[model samples]
Target: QFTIPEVPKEQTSVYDYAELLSAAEKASLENKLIKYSDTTSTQIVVVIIPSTNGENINYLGAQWGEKWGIGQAKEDNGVLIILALNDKRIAINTGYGVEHLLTDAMSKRIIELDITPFFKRKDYPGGLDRGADAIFEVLTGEYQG
Candidate 1:
């Protein structure tokens, strides 16, 4: 029974409350994700927060994505890249209407293989950059071997 925190309504691609990214890093991610979205019809969003206040990362991520309407209204192809820095938690929450392309196992793999490694090196922006590329590659049918 925990309450959800308020997310800013600025609609910026990166909600970097934890100051995880430099301005250049933020701009890079925003540009990359926006272009990917424009081309593929999939909305990929990144968010960084100081904490999740004991709430589950998945629950909070889904709630935040839904509340913010992070995807299209039609098919709702949205993905939320959420990191609770203080909690050491990250979640990739997919839009309910477009969950087929990103299964739970696939999401776990992306988190494990694509993201966590760079995060372990304290390179949040790099982790996010690679993660986004992995996601786009998979979703766009560009990485299937």
Candidate 2:
């Protein structure tokens, strides 16, 4: 009985059940995700929870994406980042098609560069904001990786 967690359909872009971001920060991130989808027809989602409920984040994020049918079904261009606060775990799940664009190496680099530093400082919002910005930059071809 490993049920996928519930995601709010109305605001599908950001889910911060771990209470990581401030209200204003969440809104700003939401706007960016919405704009990105509007222009590129790609789906990028962030899900933060206090705990992964004993499930591995790797399986949790991928299974969640499959259930949600994230990205364009044909193109399969979706990105899902799941952060577990209590567990101190992060999992980035990509839909099948766009994995080439944001490869495993690039994703690891982004986390090492933008995310871990902020996490060290206990700035969860800053970590996510910088990480998300880098993702969009890479996707938009501004960043090589």
Candidate 3:
């Protein structure tokens, strides 16, 4: 069975179980997520795992979100960016409150454009950082591209 990873502490937003990020990189991403939540009341969590261990990426993402209780219960404004390195998959799970803003098509674009490019270059930190920024922008209705 695939064990769900532990949720990060209140002050953190990045869970780098894959060991693909440095402390500085993780802090930077965490800060962005904190700021986003503070400003918009939307919670975003980034999870980097070494592998999915045969679990469906979507199911895994949902399970983590539920277990973590991400976002405000009433608003349900949470997003989970799950990256499985060995499984080679990325899942962006959005809460109902923000789905109208960060639609399925937009999520795919963010992965393909904002994220995949950096990952292709083996820049996991950069990919995640950029992905977070893109997600924030979309949620705030500020993304131009």
Candidate 4:
């Protein structure tokens, strides 16, 4: 069985086990995610792990979302941004309520366009910051495209 990491305590949105983000950066991202949740009722969590431990990235993210109950139980509007540093993989898992808004192609585009460049430069903080922004914009229907 794949082990799901523990859910963060209340009001905490970012879990950086890989130590990629500074305290300030982590705080900023967490606050942004919380604000998004407050405004839209869509809970977003950002998790960074050192490795995937041979598990499928997407499956791990899904399990985490289910186990953690990231979003409101009735609404099911949860989003998980999971990053495995050693595996060099990322997965964006969305609950059914938001799946249509944040489609697979749009998720891929955000990973590619808004995130991957900073990641390629080894800038995890910037990548995650922009990635969360992109997600928020898309969900809020503020994205131009």
Candidate 5:
């Protein structure tokens, strides 16, 4: 009995992700979005490449916005990949599972610091408030040790 097997959801995740190397992450995400079907929700997956200038970046960032909704990407073909559903306002990822980095406390700090919170508010202007300026500033100069 020869029959076609059902594709796994995780396997779909693989097709959704092409490479682990930081340079390829952003582009892969953009390609995935392009290939995505309309029936599915417009979900955004951001690839956080922990560097400044790296690499396929434009193929994804800008294309996503032009084709979908929020297509423009920063970095000048660099290391980070900020993927927004609509790329509402140049949001950056603080990394995953650290728990503390994106905590409620941190969210509160963003509110207090006269910074624009990207994900919280639904309005476009809300995203522009503090925006990417402050976050990148800390990342550029901060010492981990």
Candidate 6:
């Protein structure tokens, strides 16, 4: 049986602070989603998913659209949280190159990871790590102590 490669954990993920905003501002947009999870003034909430897909990942670079794709939502505790980029549903980010390699059962393969497939590069574990980190950040506000 073929095993899926784990998404790299040490590959530095750059936070697009501009994409994120203060919790209060987010609350103004979607009070239900932009929760008041004790996020401090110094911290912000970043919507890891596209507010709407088919848009451009211009922040990362416009060509990013050609390189990567994200999957559908996955449920955690029955709550669907999108990739750290999109604030939509539970999803995974993938690379376009890899996605094209598989013609059949792509969705089926992703289902095994509890994610549908964000874009193309299936960095499943990496997405989980970010989700976990977001939760931790929400709870502790970078409490490394």
Candidate lDDT scores, in order, read 0.84, 0.80, 0.85, 0.87, 0.32, 0.31
Candidate 5 stretches greater than 4 Å from native: 1-93, 97-104, 116-129, 142-145
Residue pairs with backbone atoms closer than 3 Å in model 3 (clashes): none
Which residue runs of candidate 2 sit more than 4 Å off their true CA positions? none
Once all C-alphas are superposed, what RMSD does model 5 give against the true structure?
A: 16.8
Candidate 5 vs. true structure, TM-score: 0.23
| Model 1 score (lDDT) | 0.84
How would you encode candidate 3's per-residue C-alpha lDDT over 65-142 as one tens digit per residue?
888887755388999999998787898988888889988899998999999999899887888889989998998888
TM-scores for candidates 1 onward, in order: 0.90, 0.89, 0.91, 0.93, 0.23, 0.24
When 4 and 5 are scored with lDDT, the better candidate is 4
Q: What is the lDDT of residue 9 in candidate 1?
A: 61
Q: Which 10 successive residues of model 5 have the least lDDT summed?
A: 71-80
Give the candidate number with the greatest lDDT. Answer: 4
Stretches of candidate 3 off by over 4 Å are: 8-11
Candidate achieving higher lDDT, 1 or 2: 1
lDDT of 5 by residue, 1-145 (tens): 1121233344221222223324354345444533431212222233322221332333444343233222123212111234223332232322222224334354335434533344465432233223333333233333121
Poorly placed runs, candidate 1 (over 4 Å) = 1-9
| Candidate 6 or 5, higher lDDT | 5
Taking all chains together, the TM-score of candidate 2 against the true structure is: 0.89
Q: What are the per-residue Cα lDDT tens digits for candidate 2 across 1-145? A: 3477665658658988887788999999888877776665578888888888899887888888888878855389898878988898887788877787778887788888878889899988888887778778777777754
Clashes of 2: 0
Task: State the lDDT of candidate 6 residue by residue for 19-121, as single tens digits.
Answer: 5434444444343222422232111122244343444232332123222212111111111233334533333223332233221243234333333332335
Prediction 5 global C-alpha lDDT: 0.32
